[model samples]
Target: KTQSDLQKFMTQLDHLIKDDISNTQEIIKDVLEYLKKLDEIYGSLRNHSQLTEALSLGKRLSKSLHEMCGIEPLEEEICSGLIEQLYKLITASRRILESCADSNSPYIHHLRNDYQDLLQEFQISLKILTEKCLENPSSLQNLSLTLVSIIKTA
Candidate 1:
């Protein structure tokens, strides 16, 4: 149930990023919509178990009776999908700024210094997320710990 929703969100985000004539206003609005979807799933799952299962193995393996299989869970998929798209979205939104090269170009409105301030702010948060999520491996430790708790003195 949640999986499909997340996929749809990612595809929508893909379209959002791929869009031509993108601007700070449109990007900001889409980002707000994206956050709405994120918060939706984050709540629907009842807790953040999706959080652990996804990050626990990360983009890694799923063990079987006598086999190990490659796996990509939706939570992790959403996690990576969001980050990857974020990188693209940032580039798309900033493309104008980087392309203008005009110290005080009058033809461009959003391509001015006034626009740069928000992009820098966005970049700070973007950089922070990149560090928090990508600076290291996620946890199999979480999976094991949760399992141990479930397999308790019953």
Candidate 2:
């Protein structure tokens, strides 16, 4: 109710927002490392059907991305778009791996090609995102400022 009370609340909110942004950055970095591992491993075993590992890793990546974006920073919406693309790539790989048992099917070849393409696109998109997130020191500060503005206005 008092001006001092509001100021204290805003300050607390700012600190919490800053902390969440730091956590999100760390989570993004972890996912980036995981993606790199996936790229190396998947690249080597394109035709193999042992995609259970890939599926697990993909699910982890998706979950982490969701958590990072759920903080609802100003950039959350943009990041969600990239997250969706990554999810699509993972789902595509899962589908192909699940059904590729019928190796004789001509469709398998097409599916394999499609999965590779998706993976490549996902890699490029993720790299850009990771760089924007981890390489930029002011990313959190920018988001924090946006949060402050929103809280102040509200």
Candidate 3:
């Protein structure tokens, strides 16, 4: 898919995660499918800095879904745990993005447009996830503003 295609794909996933999970089973299926597409995209890339970031974001997204909807007898206490996991995932992705951006890469030559576009898409998704965290307090597992740090670093 083109970059624009990917952006729409992520947005749809964010909407499903944040606002319209009327069916728990469907949420799980959508999350898994989203992650699978993410993995497929990153796996196809030869050597792209954004690929790792995408995977890391998927990890956080999946973890939250697992915590919020997958756990049978889901407990409110798990919010903090979920947050911590999300934070780590975000931070780790930022690290990958930073390290690769700082180094030499083929994309750097054509980086300006692609980088901005990708970041914009991800930032929008990040905002949606943040909103979800606000509504589902137990999904937050850690006190660290790792997602914020990741966004700043990225």
Off by over 4 Å in 1: 1-7, 10-32, 35-76, 106-109, 112-118, 126-154
State TM-scores per candidate: 0.32, 0.40, 0.35
Best by TM-score: 2
**Candidate 3 to truth, TM:** 0.35
RMSD of candidates 1 onward, in order:
19.8, 16.2, 10.3
| Better-scoring candidate (TM-score), 2 or 3 | 2
lDDT of 2 by residue, 1-154 (tens): 2223323433343354466555455555555555554554455444554444455555555555555545545344334433443453465465656755755876666555655655554454455455555666475444333333323333
| Alpha carbon lDDT at 133, candidate 1 | 45
RMSD value for candidate 2: 16.2
lDDT of each: 0.36, 0.49, 0.46
Model 1 deviation from the true structure expressed as Cα RMSD, one decimal place = 19.8
User: Backbone clashes in each candidate structure, one number apiece?
Assistant: 0, 0, 10
